[PDB]
């Protein structure tokens with residue numbers, strides 16, 4: 001499906017589920033990374 | 049001289065449900081007293 005950015009939405013990315021507000025970022029992910037985490041054990045960001 | 053907070057004005061929150069409330073008296077007000 002498509003998605004709405006900058007809005008509270010329910011997400012179900014392949015292999016990743018939860019709720020929140022999705023916004024564009026600039027995190028320097030490596031070619032072999034799918035998603036990242038915060039200092040706490042919570043997903044911080046995901047690559048589409 | 050983590051948690052949700054807000055400065056300025058921009059705010060942010062954390063999935064852990066924790067935050068910190070502001071003081072009534074800001075640093076400037078304290079400086080005024082002293």
Ligand SMILES: *[C@@H]1O[C@H](CO)[C@@H](O[C@@H]2O[C@H](CO)[C@@H](O[C@@H]3O[C@H](CO)[C@@H](O)[C@H](O)[C@@H]3O)[C@H](O)[C@H]2NC(C)=O)[C@H](O)[C@H]1NC(C)=O
Nearest residue numbers: 005006007008021023052053054055056057058059060061
């Ligand atoms: C709550 O979110 C709104 C927007 O979603 C924030 O209001 C926006 O604040 C900026 C800065 O004061 C306003 O001015 C903008 O400045 C940028 C700087 O380059 C400029 O490019 C924009 O065209 C605009 O001038 C912006 O107009 C304003 N938006 C609205 C609708 O008022 C607000 O500050 C946020 N508040 C908190 C506590 O996060």
